[PDB]
Design a protein around this ligand. Structure first.
Ligand SMILES: Nc1nc2c(ncn2[C@@H]2O[C@H](COP(=O)(O)OP(=O)(O)NP(=O)(O)O)[C@@H](O)[C@H]2O)c(=O)[nH]1
Ligand SMILES: C1CNCCNCCNCCN1
Ligand SMILES: [Ca+2]
Ligand SMILES: [Ca+2]
Ligand SMILES: [Ca+2]
Ligand SMILES: [Ca+2]
Ligand SMILES: [Mg+2]
Ligand SMILES: [Zn+2]
Length: 166
């Protein structure tokens, strides 16, 4: 069967782990334990295709892992996550995309921009602002909440469908 190597990247605390764990394990992680480098694998059916999803959950805290770049190298698709209540995380996105371009040696890499924590009312990143950024990259923008599950499958499945267009 087809394996899709997904990598979740973005600033510390934006909800990368929560999103991944919501997708794979169907619960919300309320606590904040900073990730070093975690891997998740799950067989899923996406658009009638039995898929193996191999998801790399990366560090957002810029202490780890000096060379997060080595883990990202095999990544076929990248979820670029910021939090809609964290302007800095949105501003950090460009640096994550540049790192992706670096590790893949290409400006044409399957990606989805994810505005997470959309259940929160303290929005400082408006949808249109992120839509415009995504448009400039030629990628979809999807809002998600790891807490409510809203958009979670949409974000990950869309990334799969982006890899398929590649
Ligand atoms: N309300 C709400 N809280 C969320 C959401 N996603 C994550 N959180 C919360 O945000 C905190 C950080 O989430 P986490 O997934 O650990 O972030 P991370 O991006 O993996 N962090 P790191 O980069 O350090 O590994 C946790 O307390 C988690 O419950 C969301 O969609 N909504
Ligand atoms: C990453 C960059 N791709 C640019 C060239 N396209 C064909 C390669 N597909 C696998 C690499 N995917
Ligand atoms: Ca919980
Ligand atoms: Ca390179
Ligand atoms: Ca504003
Ligand atoms: Ca479902
Ligand atoms: Mg994490
Ligand atoms: Zn390619």
């Amino acid at each position: 069967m087809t394996e899709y190597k997904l990598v979740v990247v973005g600033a510390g605390g934006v909800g990368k782990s929560a999103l991944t764990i919501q997708l794979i394990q169907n619960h919300f992680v309320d606590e904040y334990d900073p990730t070093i480098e975690d891997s998740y694998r799950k067989q899923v059916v996406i658009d009638g295709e039995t898929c193996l999803l191999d998801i790399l959950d990366t560090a957002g805290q810029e202490e780890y892992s000096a060379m997060r770049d080595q883990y990202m190298r095999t990544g076929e698709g990248f979820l670029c996550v910021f939090a809609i209540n964290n302007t800095k995380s949105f501003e950090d996105i460009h640096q994550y995309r540049e790192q992706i371009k670096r590790v893949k040696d290409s400006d044409d890499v399957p990606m989805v921009l994810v505005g997470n924590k959309c259940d929160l009312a303290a929005r400082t990143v408006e949808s249109r602002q992120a839509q415009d950024l995504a448009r400039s990259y030629g990628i979809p923008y999807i809002e998600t909440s790891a807490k409510t599950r809203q958009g979670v499958e949409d974000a990950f499945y869309t990334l799969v469908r982006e890899i398929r267009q590649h």
